């Protein structure tokens, strides 16, 4: 019946055979989950005297 058994889970898609398998099996979101700087509450309260 030429199904599309889940290729990620291991079941090869019905069209594929021998050693072919599916190749694009997931859409990569090209936007990373990045963190931000943890805030500072003591560094601002500091005058700088040169040396």
């Amino acid at each position: 019946m030429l199904n599309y058994n889940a290729p990620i889970d291991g079941q090869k898609s019905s069209i594929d055979g021998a050693g072919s398998d599916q190749m694009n099996t997931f859409y990569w979101l090209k936007k990373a989950i990045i963190q931000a700087r943890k805030d500072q509450y003591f560094m601002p309260l500091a005058s700088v005297t040169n040396m």
Binding site: M1, N3, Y4, N5
Partner: protein, 50 residues
């Protein structure tokens, strides 16, 4: 367990049926009365008994 889950081979799966009930309500009759005699409204202490 009971979630409707389809596969690629869509077929006769996950059939659902609905039911329709009914609510009733009746009608009842009440009533009462009282009797008096002309000898009880003609010579009686009060004028407006009726």
């Amino acid at each position: 367990s009971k979630l409707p889950l389809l596969t690629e081979n869509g077929g006769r799966v996950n059939r659902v049926g609905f039911t329709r009930l009914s609510r009733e309500g009746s009608i009842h009759k009440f009533g009462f009365f009282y009797e008096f005699t002309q000898e009880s409204l003609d010579f009686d202490s009060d004028d407006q008994l009726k």
